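hey so i finaly got around to running the thing on Double-stranded RNA-binding protein 3 from Arabidopsis thaliana. pasting the sequence first so u can double check i didnt mess up the copy paste, my clipboard has been acting weird all day
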Amino acid sequence: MYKNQLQELAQRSCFSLPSYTCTREGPDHAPRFKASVNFNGEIFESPTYCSTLRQAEHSAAEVALSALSSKGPSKLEH
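ok and heres what it spat out for the 3d tokens, dont ask me to read them lol
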């Protein structure tokens, strides 16, 4: 949902579609996930630990989406 919304914004610019990558590091006993997303030349990575790559992609997309709007959404607003 949120991820798709971010992609739609890029399509409107007719510039380039968003890109995301996922890497796996750390021991099997203590696995660590890390993903990075590049949107409009800006790179955003999950700021919190992600159990699965799905969370990493969401965290990256959310950061890019929020960054694009630039602290747009607010609790006080509306």
